[PDB]
Structures are given as C-alpha cells and as structure tokens.
C-alpha cells in the first residue's frame, strides 16, 4: 500500500516499510490548482483470509 505518513515502530509492527521516491499533492490556489511534492512510502504486509 501507498502512504505519505512515515510509520512508528509500535503501531506498525507487522509492516515492512520502504520509501519509494516522491509524489505530488494538489490543492486550491485562488482560481487554480497547484501541486506540492512530498515523499511516498510503501507499506508491505502478509496476511491470511478465508471464505
């Protein structure tokens, strides 16, 4: 999964995390839209399921 909020060791224990380059955020500016770059993280995890 993709995320823009770095993790903390306690809440995110089952997760292996990386940093995958950067991305962009878009917000209003008067009558137009603008973009501010931010980092990007990738949260990897394994899990089971059932029917």
């Amino acid at each position: 999964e993709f995320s823009i909020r770095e993790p903390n060791l306690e809440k995110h224990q089952k997760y292996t995390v990386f940093e995958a380059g950067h991305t962009t955020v878009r917000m209003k500016k008067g009558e137009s839209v603008i973009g501010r770059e931010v980092p990007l993280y990738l949260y990897c995890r394994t899990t089971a399921l059932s029917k």
């Binding site: 999964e1 993709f2 995320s3 823009i4 909020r5 993790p7 306690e10 809440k11 995110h12 224990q13 089952k14 997760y15 292996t16 995390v17 990386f18 940093e19 995958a20 380059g21 991305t23 990007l40 990738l42 949260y43 899990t47 399921l49």
Partner: protein
Amino acid sequence: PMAPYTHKFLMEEAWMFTKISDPERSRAGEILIDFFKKGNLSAIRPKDKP
C-alpha cells in the same frame, strides 16, 4: 507491549491516485492497467534498505 494495527488495509495513513472513470473499462483488471499506463506506478522504486 502496545497492541499493534490489525485490519488488512490502512485507514488513516492511506493515500490514493485518482483518475477519471470510464464505464467501458469498469473492472479491476482494466482499472489497474489504465493506472499503470500513465506511468505513476512504474516510477515507484523502493530503495533497498527499509
């Protein structure tokens, strides 16, 4: 130790790329391919050390 997160997906720390919806390509197999075409996924290249 504190109880960690358990749900399968991420709720608050999530993030999403968006695109306009086409009714002729409204399926998982197709939506994913389209998202890949504009090339924002291929740019995701995690570095080695986590």
